[PDB]
Amino acid sequence: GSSHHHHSLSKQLYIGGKLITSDATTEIINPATLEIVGEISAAGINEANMALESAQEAFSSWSTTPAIERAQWMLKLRDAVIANEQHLRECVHLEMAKPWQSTADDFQMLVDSLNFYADAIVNIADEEIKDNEGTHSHVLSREPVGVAAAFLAWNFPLLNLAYKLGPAMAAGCPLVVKPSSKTPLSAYAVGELCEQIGLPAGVVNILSGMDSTVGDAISASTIPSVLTLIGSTNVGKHVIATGATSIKRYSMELGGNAPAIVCSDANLDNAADVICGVKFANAGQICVTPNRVFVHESVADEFIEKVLTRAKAVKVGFDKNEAIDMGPVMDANSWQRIDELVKDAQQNGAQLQLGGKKPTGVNGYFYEPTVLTNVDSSMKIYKDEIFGPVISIIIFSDNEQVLSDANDTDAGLSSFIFSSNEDTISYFAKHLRFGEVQVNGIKYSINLPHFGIKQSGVGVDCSLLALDDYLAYKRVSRALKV
Amino acid sequence: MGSSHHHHLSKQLYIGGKLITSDATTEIINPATLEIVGEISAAGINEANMALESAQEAFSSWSTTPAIERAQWMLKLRDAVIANEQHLRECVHLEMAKPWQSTADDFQMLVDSLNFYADAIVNIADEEIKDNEGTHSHVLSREPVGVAAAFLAWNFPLLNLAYKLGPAMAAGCPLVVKPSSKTPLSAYAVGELCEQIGLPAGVVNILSGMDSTVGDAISASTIPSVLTLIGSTNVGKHVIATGATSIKRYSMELGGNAPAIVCSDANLDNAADVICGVKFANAGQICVTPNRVFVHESVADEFIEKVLTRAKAVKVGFDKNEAIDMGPVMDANSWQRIDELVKDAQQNGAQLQLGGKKPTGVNGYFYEPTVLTNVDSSMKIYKDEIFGPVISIIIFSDNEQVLSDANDTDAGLSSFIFSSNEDTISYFAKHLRFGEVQVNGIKYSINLPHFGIKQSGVGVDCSLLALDDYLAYKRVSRALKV
Amino acid sequence: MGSSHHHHSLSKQLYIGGKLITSDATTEIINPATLEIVGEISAAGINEANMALESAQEAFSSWSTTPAIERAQWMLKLRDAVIANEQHLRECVHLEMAKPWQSTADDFQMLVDSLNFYADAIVNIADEEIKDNEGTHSHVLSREPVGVAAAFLAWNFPLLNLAYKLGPAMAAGCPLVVKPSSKTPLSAYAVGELCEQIGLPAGVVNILSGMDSTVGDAISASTIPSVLTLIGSTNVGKHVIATGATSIKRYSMELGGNAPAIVCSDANLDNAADVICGVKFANAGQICVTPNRVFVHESVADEFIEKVLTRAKAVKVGFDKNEAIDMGPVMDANSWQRIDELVKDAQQNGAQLQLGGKKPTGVNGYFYEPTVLTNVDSSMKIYKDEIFGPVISIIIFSDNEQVLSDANDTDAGLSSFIFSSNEDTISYFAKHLRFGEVQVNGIKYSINLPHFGIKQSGVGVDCSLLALDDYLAYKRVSRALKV
Amino acid sequence: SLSKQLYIGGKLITSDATTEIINPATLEIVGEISAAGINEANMALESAQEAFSSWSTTPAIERAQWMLKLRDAVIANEQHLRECVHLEMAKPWQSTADDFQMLVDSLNFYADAIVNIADEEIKDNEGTHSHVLSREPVGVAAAFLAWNFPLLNLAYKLGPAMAAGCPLVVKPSSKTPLSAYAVGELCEQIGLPAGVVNILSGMDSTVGDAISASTIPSVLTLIGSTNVGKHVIATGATSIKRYSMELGGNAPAIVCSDANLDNAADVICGVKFANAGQICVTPNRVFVHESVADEFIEKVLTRAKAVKVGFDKNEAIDMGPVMDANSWQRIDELVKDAQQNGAQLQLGGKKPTGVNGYFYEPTVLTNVDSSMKIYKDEIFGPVISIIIFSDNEQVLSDANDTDAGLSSFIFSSNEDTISYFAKHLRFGEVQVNGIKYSINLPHFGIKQSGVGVDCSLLALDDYLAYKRVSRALKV
């Protein structure tokens, strides 16, 4: 699976504590059935400015609301999320054809984050700093930073929202949320729940619209003190440059290219379950999933056989009342991009062992579980992020050489090492230039920090560190001799 | 101790462990005598690219050099700095016309930072993270980030270098430094000391050149992982946009507009000593020095009299073998900018109590200690950063009203409160929207965090937190069931 | 000819090094009338920009040494492909900025006219012998290709702005790197497709769009270009000059304008209203040479204002290539708000809104109604700044010598207009107006007529033979006669 | 011995600072000038701006009359003008004639050219409009002059600027400011209207940047180094300005096998030793074919031995010292770096015996190749670096292997070798079997050597702006 361990189809914008319409609508098409599943009120530049000014107007009172009272609001919203679980998961199911069991990750992370950051914020304590000369006292404290704006990717609509909504509410930062236009229903539904519980106006705002107009207007605004993004590396560079109209804190999780190293002493059944599980969950559209699977030559044939067995057993389709393991990819551009990487690999010598096409007799953006062997470092599927249900296998023999190959990327999100040797595990854990090194498994949770280095982004999601973006320091220094 | 920092010539480019010349030179003019006092080899984009490429090649060896061993290099450099104290302070004296005693801030902060961060990096310890499900173990560690680049302001040529050099060396990031072309001599002298001790090539690089070409080439390069800047908010925003060729970490200290509030129950002698001390130290060219002095009407006549007495006793001039309190400002642009702020205030009702002109019979960029009263929120001197030896006084009546006036700025660096009332102190310390609140005094040191909020920048200089920009996290998670 | 220029798309890839290529990025194109996506381009990064610069550099020795006859042959082969794809090229301009269908002809036709004019001009370039006063040497003065050229194009005339640089650069054998505005890149990307179709030699023409602070700065800061040319604002003009200082480069640019249009007591009021209204509402007033300050004499003020209001009311506003539309919307919301602030600022300082000054009722896009303001004075923002919109700003004057000082009271120096029947008055204003162009009782621009500004409006000349000067470098060969 | 004041706003004024001028041959003080500060630079710029409306509207016939009046005073003060040059940089008396004569030639050439400027009619293809193309003064001009030719460099800018009605702000090099200050005294003596010509010297970083960064100048012109040119471009970006520059060169001189070796040695040695080789168009790399190598080296050695080096107004001195200690050390390190990589020093390469002045002997280097810094960088000194070649196509590739693009030299008697090199040499000027420069011949560089043209009618282009007047014929 994803290894994220837990702890009215017409919707309007949620701006300024009210549900409002606009001058335009957006029809949402299910990527499996290609049928319209709903519509949202689409935001324009005028609606973006309304959300920003409403968030700014709320900052003074929301940031001075005691932390215990802000937590009370977070738990009241949590209780409404729990009471409306079925509709929230149905929104994600419809907008992106995510399997019904897979929608539990989105819903439950929303509950977990609300719980985690409501509990963490009431435990924040001031810190005293020693004065080496004995002349002054020093108290270090943390205060809300300002208005925050969040651009969410479509792969996990409610989980991505949970990563930002939790810390912002807890840290008293009025939040402007732009869900992806491909998956807005579930976020708009959260906005309906905020309106239902009577959340103070401006504290949370949810609006979707076109990127080059609404997205740029949020970035170029001088109101936001923090701009946070989950998306592509090129969009991250666009947000940084566009947000330069003022001084802003940036934090983003961008593209990855995770190497997975399976050694000769590795538990092959466990390595196969872990890799296939996360490579086919959400159809491989996962930031931390393996992108290049390196396998030792001595266990290559046996490991490929174990991978094919699991890949053939993946249940593909779109049916909430069946045990579907994997759905389609997001849209047509994603399908053709994945297919171009797979076909280019074959044309350069890679061997297709399974999949590599759309299931016959279907029209949605389905791509079959794919297994590619004989992949080398000169191929485009090696250099680029697949973000799809494709297992690409590279054969290695020297631990020192495969370490250099694993590091031969600008990405810096996750990485995997499967081995039974303690010196081998220690060797790769220290030298892998990645934010996360998963040993003999994979584990993510609201209390564990999730982050990338290098060109995979800035900042941390989950854990107490996620509050860093939304809290600013203050040093009060007083002379003791008055 | 007026500046509040509490302690604890033809020069070539230093690039890739070697001292090299170029095709051009830059003359350095003393701002007091208007005479040439030195020359440096000016860098072009070719020299900028050499420093970047040499720092990139050094990252593999320097980042994997043991922290104890990197600290030994920092102490070796510190030993050469101490042995060259006179020449280093002479460079600051010549390029800035700083009084001899005021060059101690530059020199001693360089020693203090090398000591503090050599000691800090060897005490960095890993952090265990608890797994709530008991299925995995989690180890959080910190590693070098990559190449760092630093753009330094001219007001503290060696102290500004100290804030970046200490953390970057300790954290194993090769550093590319661009001192201001107005004050490059003292930094170039540090490059000579680096070469003298045999520092590995690329670990430190010093080069000065045009902002439009050399500065942009450094920001636009894809090599730097961290961009740090001490400067103006316009250069800040420019660096963020031009750096958007890659994902970079940004650390900045920009404009300040510090309010200093002298209440009815304040120690007037102490308040006048602190305010006057830092307002005339370095000719008021200090990021944390008060910009707007608010004084309660009940003690305004007495406090203004104490300010004028101190301001009249300031000895202005330039001579290393004389006892001089205050030197001139940096250049003609600064002189005219300061003078326009004073004249504009006079044209709108401000009363010139002292100064407001160049002293008699001198040609350098000297500006007399200036005192203005009857200043209001509409004047340019209220809205903009003086960065000069001008005390601008506003009379207030209500503590809750003056708090709103104090916060009526986008700056977020330092602030000051002078009061003997514990409730008044707690009220201002909590509600002042600034990174630092100085109560009944002023205190800065290498162990105390120095940071600004809002449009005054992002990041922390000094204290352990200054390492955060140069260190990247890593989570190693291992399945315990194996 | 309302614009005064007298004639003689789902997904597009980058045209770099003679190949159509994709990138890791993608830029959507929004129509400013419908606010819907109409197109898609592969966005360039600094890597693609350096690929274009390097391919253009590699092509210089081969392209610059290609005979002028053969280069003009390639220019006519491109021209034939332009004519064969006129429909698609104009639909690209129509879609990217909602320009009325007839107004798209200025873009398309100037592309044809420039390819013809400079293909013919380059083959008539002859050497010039220089006399030696001492009889000791011979002197031959010739002209050669200067190097690689880079062009930054504005959005107001996507293909016409391309035409001004593509013609001369191809003819003079300078490999060209073109950066269209990211607001209107569709039309130029289509020309790149045509270049690839006819098999133009690699590196001779390169077309790419991307962010200004990254892609645009990478082109200017490159040491490869010998000539940097720009059609844009005064602020980006100064930015390009400073950023290009990494090497010695020729600069040529057309920047902001602030044209005065003086309607005297003896002017043909019908002719003056037709000319001023025609160019003020063509392309929604987004024209560098259009009047910005309309000065009208006291005795003819009321009569001229009524004639202006009659024409402004007749302007048909909308967006449909299969309807009769005079005027479309402005480019984006920033321009709309910028124009609206100028109109409201004037009202707050005493100007009288006679017509328009708002978006038309019940419409979606960035439409701004044809606007007429009277009682405008020199203190207003609308007097000091460039409107670049469909606003006629009228100032009443009484003295010809005073209105001459008022007209010259600007740092702009593009076009200017004088309407009068008095020959002495015409000679007085044409001599004393400090502008690059003085238009008397009309307005006229064409591929053979030089178009240029002075003062802070820019340097260099577009159109006419003089436009070649930026792409050609002189050479003097001097030989001692005494063997 | 002489004290010269600033010429600003039609007045001779003093300032708070002074600069002493030291002769580079005797190392003795020869005079002083009132040094300009930023305030004096603003004064000159504002006075030039103030004069623009009256001076640019002064008839071209009347402007030419002021140029000839200045010319008359220049002729009457020839001895003193050439004495300043002789004293400020120890230029030999015979060589100072080029500085003085170019000043009188430029005043004459451009006072006559401006009164013959005629409007041009442009044809309207449609017959609906008439079009007249005229030229008008651009605005205030500022000129930064190098020290190698103090008066000749001034002449290149003063003539066109006065003729085109552009008030001019002149910053002579602080190393050679005396001769130009003397011109300013003549400008004050004849009663030239205030602001039309302004002369001031000062610190490059303060006074030079204050002129470039000011928004008043419409034209920034410079004769100097390539690095200074890039600095002026970026610094002047505070407004839109016209730039015209003559920067560094690296002229290749190709001595083929069928060349007149006597004539080639005369031309090359003559210009390589005049002004101590401190000439923008002097050969920097001398390419000689193998068949004529040792015969040409011998002839070059003969003329280089006959060079009379010294500093004496009453002696027929051929060559003085170089400008300062920086230039001497820079030239010496180029020769010793070439020797350290295999260059055979044949003559000179040292300071003459017991001189102590900044003298560098006439130097001849052989066995120079493309690796050496003396091959890549501009010598700007009395050094002849010879490179042996064999094939014409290969040495043409070597000749163009530079970012410079000023002058070039081809010596050959074959008509096809002449046409082959004259076409493929990527330089602004190709001198064939000789060298010629005059006020009427255009002087310019391409590539990294600058933009714009000095001398000839094309020099007026930087100071004149076009205007198209178009009228509707049907009214």
Author numbering:
A (entry chain B): -20 to -14, 1 to 475
B (entry chain D): -21 to -14, 2 to 475
C (entry chain C): -21 to -14, 1 to 475
D (entry chain A): 1 to 475
Sentences from the paper on this structure:
The first step in processing the free DA monosaccharide that would result from complete depolymerization of carrageenan is performed by a 3,6-anhydro-d-galactose dehydrogenase, which is putatively encoded by the dauA gene (locus tag EU509_08920 in PS47) in the CarPUL of Pseudoalteromonas sp.33. Recombinant DauA displayed activity on DA when using NADP+ as a co-factor. Thus, the enzyme(s) associated with this activity remain(s) to be uncovered in Pseudoaltermonas sp. However, the PS47 CarPUL does encode an active NADP+ dependent 3,6-anhydro-d-galactose dehydrogenase (DauA) that would initiate cytoplasmic processing of free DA.
The polysaccharides in red algae (Rhodophyta) are primarily mixed galactan agars such as agarose and carrageenan. Carrageenans are high molecular weight polymers having a linear backbone of repeating D-galactopyranose units (G) linked together by alternating α-1,3 and β-1,4 linkages. Furthermore, transcriptomics revealed upregulation of the CarPUL during growth on ι-carrageenan, while biochemical analysis of eight CarPUL-encoded enzymes revealed carrageenan-specific activity, thus associating the CarPUL with the ability of these pseudoalteromonads to liberate energy from carrageenan.
